[PDB]
Curated annotation (Swiss-Prot):
Record note on modification: Phosphorylated to form H2AS128ph (gamma-H2A) in response to DNA double-strand breaks (DSBs) generated by exogenous genotoxic agents and by stalled replication forks. Phosphorylation is dependent on the DNA damage checkpoint kinases MEC1/ATR and TEL1/ATM, spreads on either side of a detected DSB site and may mark the surrounding chromatin for recruitment of proteins required for DNA damage signaling and repair. N-acetylated by NAT4.
Other remarks in the entry: In contrast to vertebrates and insects, its C-terminus is not monoubiquitinated.
Organism of this sequence: Saccharomyces cerevisiae (strain ATCC 204508 / S288c)
Residues of the full protein shown: 17 to 69 of 132
Taxonomic lineage of the native organism: Eukaryota, Fungi, Dikarya, Ascomycota, Saccharomycotina
UniProt subunit comment: The nucleosome is a histone octamer containing two molecules each of H2A, H2B, H3 and H4 assembled in one H3-H4 heterotetramer and two H2A-H2B heterodimers. The octamer wraps approximately 147 bp of DNA.
Broad class of where this protein is predominantly found: nucleus
This protein's encoding gene: HTA1
N6-succinyllysine modifications at: K6
GO molecular function, one term: DNA binding
Signal peptide annotation: none
Induction of the gene: Transcribed during late G1 and S-phase, repressed in G2.
Protein name (record): Histone H2A.1
Coiled coil stretches, renumbered: none
Role according to the record: Core component of nucleosome which plays a central role in DNA double strand break (DSB) repair. Nucleosomes wrap and compact DNA into chromatin, limiting DNA accessibility to the cellular machineries which require DNA as a template. Histones thereby play a central role in transcription regulation, DNA repair, DNA replication and chromosomal stability. DNA accessibility is regulated via a complex set of post-translational modifications of histones, also called histone code, and nucleosome remodeling.
Amino acid sequence: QSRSAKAGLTFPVGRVHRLLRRGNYAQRIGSGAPVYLTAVLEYLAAEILELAG
DNA sequence: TCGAGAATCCCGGTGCCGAGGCCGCTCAATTGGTCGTAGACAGCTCTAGCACCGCTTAAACGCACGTACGCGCTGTCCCCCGCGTTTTAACCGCCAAGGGGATTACTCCCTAGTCTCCAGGCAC
């Protein structure tokens, strides 16, 4: 399974990893940080979508 | 009244702790040949704003009832405030234990680079 769906989530991981890789935010990057961004933004999106419903 | 002696005003001397300067120094500032890579210009199109107005069209300008309330005055009424008095803990100095902050670095572990194969993703 790809990294965008290995954790069973909704938001893509490769998209935010490509955004930080060329956005020049650090020298290196840990493996847990893009999926952590994935989890935080998908939880914020799900909460505001439940409130929108 | 003279004069000597004690008190005080003003002038001169001296601690004193913060601003200024300094020797030693030691990991950064300079320059360099190179090298993959940003980037600036240009044909060419294509596409979004602008003007005129065809045709309607609600909406603002401005004046007229009228009464709600902003500003000012008058009376009320009371609650912080100056002040006195009693209490109290803050600041300072000091004795004491010790505990995380700082500095050194190594295997290991996670990433830049690499190529290779595949499943996402807005357009038809």
